[PDB]
Amino acid sequence: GAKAGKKVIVEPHRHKGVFVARGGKEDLLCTANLVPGESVYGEKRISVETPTKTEYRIWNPFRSKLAAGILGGLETIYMKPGSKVLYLGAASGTSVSHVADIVGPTGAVYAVEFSHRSGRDLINMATRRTNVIPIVEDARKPMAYRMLVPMVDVIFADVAQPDQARIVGINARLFLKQGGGLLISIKASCIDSTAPPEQVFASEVQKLREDKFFPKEQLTLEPYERDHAMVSCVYLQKEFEG
Amino acid sequence: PSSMFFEHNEALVPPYNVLVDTNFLSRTVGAKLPLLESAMDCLYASVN
């Protein structure tokens, strides 16, 4: 396997922020770590001594559907460095740490955890990384942190809830700039167990267009997870930013 | 596309989602055919 201490190189990936570490027999995904030299979850990290302080962190795609989607090769995830990134589903903040490392010390992540102990993990990672603020409350009630979240540009969402479309609809209606960019994770077994998952995907899409989006890309993150679809869309317009 | 096994669709299950064309609709109600009854007839399947 990709055992520790191997000499690999890092090159830029076409989305900003993310880099790709390639070496020997292994190619894999990585991001500049803000808080240098300290793991998040016993993740592997990459050192480099530049002519010291700079260190990167690998992601596991099996762990984060965000990673898996990038490896599948989405077009654009809208979260350039500097972009205010709402998260939904701060499942103890692993991928949230990764996305914080993307948006950097100039960006911002506002996170939503509903469970408490996961939230303890979450606020721990927030206490480390300054650019992510946590929010622990019910994502179904964006009134609960309407005082706390300003206008963000990209909504990531990965909650496993059956009302997912109306959830993202209301949170978008309260927190998204015209020209909104969003990604959402679909577990077809969670939305509708009986149905064929592709049609499940379609129904999700049509609910989202009903809630005024425009889908523009969509793929099964297949060789990293079964029956999940990443969907990329825009709020309220066609081209991405403005 | 997902669930596409070599020009065979494994995902198409009743309730079958069907699309209606204009000329289809025109010649069917010309042929005096109850659309949904005849659809459940040819399919022997629940349709939307």
Add this chain to the structure above:
Amino acid sequence: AAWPKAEDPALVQELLDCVQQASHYRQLKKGANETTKSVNRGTSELVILAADTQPLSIVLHIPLICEEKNVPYVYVPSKVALGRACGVSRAVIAVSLTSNEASDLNSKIRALRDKVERLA
């Protein structure tokens, strides 16, 4: 603390029924460590945790990774009944039944996970 507790009305018995079905179909991992490794490997379809267990922190630390993976976890009030419903000769406090691509037990899991999804 165990707020996703299951209730009496045959819900618990449906759980034990599908548990015995999974023990027969060999789609079931058992005991806290193997449940942990199955949900770590993400293969688990659903996870059931006892509630009468001597101090509950085991079946409290499991819902942490259940909340990470976002797998339906559910509290059952009798670990000895879990042992009997699995066919062990020993009382079990943690069980995890995984998913396969071809079974009707899978449909039973779908119904059961929808019920616990409405529950929590």
Add this chain to the structure above:
Amino acid sequence: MSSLRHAIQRRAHKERAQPLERQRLGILEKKKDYRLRARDYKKKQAVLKSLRQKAAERNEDEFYFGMMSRKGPGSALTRGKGFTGTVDGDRGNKALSVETVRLLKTQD
């Protein structure tokens, strides 16, 4: 058709081999070998031909600018014995003036 033929019909011929009292003269050239020979020979003669094309229709009086900057063919008398009408492309070396040679020799 192809289904109107026996398998022993479909069977092959094998080519004969050189008489074993004659392997001295190399392989026994058959039609594969022949055409590969004539492929190469047609090609190389056509290239010779197009060359004599250009040499006959050669204007005696052209002038590019490599002519001020290259080293020409010349002739039998000019170069003498190392003469092949091709022209010399300098391998990439040059006359090192003194100071550079000094620094180099210092390192040496």
Add this chain to the structure above:
Amino acid sequence: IQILGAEKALFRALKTKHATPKYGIIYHASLVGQASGPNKGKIARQLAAKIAL
């Protein structure tokens, strides 16, 4: 004394014929900081010999 210290750098540049390092610890020494560039080299030599003295 002029190159006192820079041993790996020196012996690399010599054993493969590269340009030699100009100074060692004398760089962080106080007097050479007030030179400039080509001047820093000339001061490096001069400070070398007077130090040996």
Add this chain to the structure above:
Amino acid sequence: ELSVRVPQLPGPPDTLSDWYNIPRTNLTPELKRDLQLLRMRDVVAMGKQFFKKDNRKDFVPEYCQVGTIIAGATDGVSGRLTRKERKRTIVEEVLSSDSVSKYKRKYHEIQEHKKSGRKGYYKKLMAARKR
């Protein structure tokens, strides 16, 4: 409080703002060999792993950095290289692995196959014709 300024008034860019300043690659010949190896990482795995043949003509990325894996605290019994296997360079690592024999084997196969009928063959014919 209000002091005199300093004057300092006296091409394609150097470090990348849009990727947290990966520097432009200094091109050590070892790094060039490394990149040659990486573009050939297909043939490294002698048939045991096929990669997506990401081949430009220009195998060089204009931005890069040479790094090393730190520590997988989950796996420290085998997922880590021993000191005598912690080599300075990628090509050194692939040197220190096995199947260098197998490389040599395949190379000498192709050596034969291209020495097939080229020139020593013909000289042998003309010799046994001249005698």
Add this chain to the structure above:
Amino acid sequence: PNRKKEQRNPRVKKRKKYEEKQKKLRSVKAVYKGGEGPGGYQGELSGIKTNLVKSVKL
């Protein structure tokens, strides 16, 4: 004409066509093939192509 063992026993013939159809299936699309290995995460083991996009445009 000569026939083969598969064309002799029709059942085992219909075995081998399906696997060959399944090996080619992986040659077009990806199939779940189980999640990550128990040895842990060791990289996207066969290449990653940043100029490669497989999103279906809606």
Add this chain to the structure above:
Amino acid sequence: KPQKKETYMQKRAVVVGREERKLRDLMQKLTTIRKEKIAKRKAKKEAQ
């Protein structure tokens, strides 16, 4: 015209060492076998 005379720079480059020799030899064999593979893959693509 192939040089006979042995130039100064040729005289004055250094002798290389065993590590670098084993390295270049490995690199050599690697590029060669890549070359043969790309020729054969292109031949098959020509055939298809």
